[PDB]
């Protein structure tokens with residue numbers, strides 16, 4: 506039951522190559538299997554290590570002070586998922602404990618082959634409301650805001666709630682830092 | 686049965702504000718309802734008008750010659766969807782962009798909702814892309830396409846129509862990359 510995150514980092518700056526390279530390099534990526542291509546990067550591992558890596562990459566990118574966006578898809582349970590392309594402690598948490606970044610976010614939860622999917626989606630919104638990160642609903646997505654630590658905590662709570670109930674789920678996120 | 690596309694345009698350039706503004710302004714947006722916020726824009730309308738608009742926006746952005754990416758989600762049929770936020774047949778951009786070209790390497794994922802046969806629809810999607818010559822390979826969590834934008838958007842619309850004819854609520858994510866500096870050009 507391997508978790509994955511396929512994401513892209515978008516630096517709105519002439520210095521984009523360096524910004525991406527630095528954010529990935531600055532992160533402790535030792536607990537996730539990674540593959541980068543010219544469109545995106547995929548991370549695979551436990552839920553814990555995938556979310557820990559994803560937050561750290563965002564915080565390092567945001568702390569470039571450039572306008573950057575992280576847009577990706579979390580997935581777990583996909584039918585036929587390989588047992589390979591993988592290799593506890595949130596290895597980045599201490600290192601980034603003093604970093605902050607605002608993380609306004611649009612996200613969408615996709616519980617697959619699930620008759621009660623709209624209910625799982627409503628529970629996701631309820632979790633965001635309880636945690637203080639929910640802003641509003643929009644067409645095709647919900648909106649979160651707050652600091653990255655809180656927004657990533659909400660996103661993980663939602664994903665965990667859903668993956669406990671339904672075999673295959675995905676969840677898109679679109680998180681914007683230093684927006685003009 | 687209104688179709689939608691929530692998308693972001695990411696120009697990897699200091700001039701990003703101007704690039705996004707131009708791409709949206711250059712497009713004939715007369716047949717889609719739009720709403721833009723600081724993260725994304727949503728288009729709503731007919732399948733035809735939404736895809737016509739999406740392709741044009743991509744083509745105009747790419748012809749800025751800057752590295753730009755379009756990332757978004759097409760959606761149709763969500764339970765309880767409003768009958769509002771649309772406008773009440775021709776692909777209005779088709780002719781204006783008929784001479785534009787742009788590489789469209791793409792990762793995409795189809796999500797047929799509340800559908801026991803979804804993995805089968807996804808396989809049908811791969812079959813369409815192969816049939817049209819745009820399929821490259823499967824990757825974790827997505828399929829890859831490549832070709833010119835007119836070809837890639839054609840594959841994407843075909844996949845979308847195939848799925849929406851079979852299941853009530855579908856979504857489909859797309860990530861299209863133009864002018865990547867790592868791409869080898871002849």
Ligand SMILES: [Ca+2]
Nearest residue numbers: 710711712713
């Ligand atoms: Ca216009």
